[PDB]
């Protein structure tokens, strides 16, 4: 992914949550995909909105192509004061 | 297939 990308910025909630699920990485033979988006959460109310099926390319400006699922999760957990995501819509 | 909420 490099042609039609979307840059998303979201501030975490009171509990330090964004309201979205991730699947894949380097340890999993599948890219990082946003599997689920919870309603009324930062991921659901941000502009542009983070949608289900979006392929994650960057997390806070870092390339996560060679990173495992656990590392990807911990990188998102280190942006809590906003989370930056570069995704490919699907 | 691992899934994690954030």
TrEMBL record, chain B:
It comes from the Eukaryota. Signal peptide: none annotated. Belongs to the protein kinase superfamily. CMGC Ser/Thr protein kinase family. MAP kinase subfamily. This is mitogen-activated protein kinase. It comes from Homo sapiens. The lineage of its organism: Eukaryota, Metazoa, Chordata, Craniata, Vertebrata. The gene is MAPK12. The chain holds residues 272 to 277 of 277 of the full protein.
